[model samples]
Target: IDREHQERNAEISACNARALSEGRPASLVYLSRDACDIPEHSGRCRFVKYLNF
Candidate 1:
């Protein structure tokens, strides 16, 4: 029985908000899934999901 090995962080909620609403990856304005697809992609590019097989 693990006790203290993989415990969750107390401030994880704060970090979660940071990822979704913070810098480059702001989940509200738009999403930058993978900017490497285009060469002329400046900042604040609209988001779109990538398809796979």
Candidate 2:
């Protein structure tokens, strides 16, 4: 479980780096099928809150 979570974090970090380098606007969204939460992304980009019905 720990290894899996670490791997997920690595991927998320890569994604964030790519997003930052591309200079494209993005939203750190709380998705329905989420792998991890990027709360810090809110400081740099738009943050989206999701509500499940």
Candidate 3:
């Protein structure tokens, strides 16, 4: 639980959105996953899922 994690999550989301906008496939492995993976990954990545392209 830290600001860095929150910031990184936002970054990942924004990056994914950009890739989508460019019509490119993108996904996040979400490093935070290992640390959070609680409640079906709800705790990890701050509830953000491993997005697929």
Candidate 4:
């Protein structure tokens, strides 16, 4: 748990917020990267989306 950790989590949160705004659902399998570490869920999802970078 260090610099890069928060850095990564930032991307996750960003997507979550964006998703809420977009008001739509998308398949995380294509949204996220190789792994999804979202706090709401207690599992390593292998999909992520909405990375502004």
lDDT of each: 0.31, 0.46, 0.57, 0.47
- Arranged by TM-score, best first: 3, 2, 4, 1
Candidate 3 CA-lDDT value: 0.57
lDDT of 1 by residue, 1-53 (tens): 01211121223334556877655342222123342122233333322323110
Better of 1 and 2 by TM-score: 2
TM-score for each predicted model, relative to the true structure? 0.24, 0.46, 0.51, 0.41
Winner on TM-score between 2 and 3 is: 3
Quote the lDDT for 1 in model 4. 28
Tell me each candidate's RMSD, in Å, in order: 14.1, 10.4, 6.7, 8.7
Tell me how far candidate 4 lies from the true structure as C-alpha RMSD in angstroms. 8.7
Q: What is candidate 2's CA lDDT for residue 31?
A: 32
With a 3 Å backbone cut-off (N, CA, C), the pairs that clash in candidate 1 are none
Candidate number achieving the greatest TM-score relative to the actual structure: 3
On a 0 to 100 scale, what is the lDDT of residue 32 in model 1? 35
Tens-digit lDDT track of model 4 for 1-53: 23444676666567767787899663232123344444433244433334332
Model 2, span 1-53: residue lDDT tens = 34544664566566667777899643333332243333444434333333211
Off by over 4 Å in 2: 25-53
Answer with 3 or 4, whichever has the higher TM-score.
Answer: 3
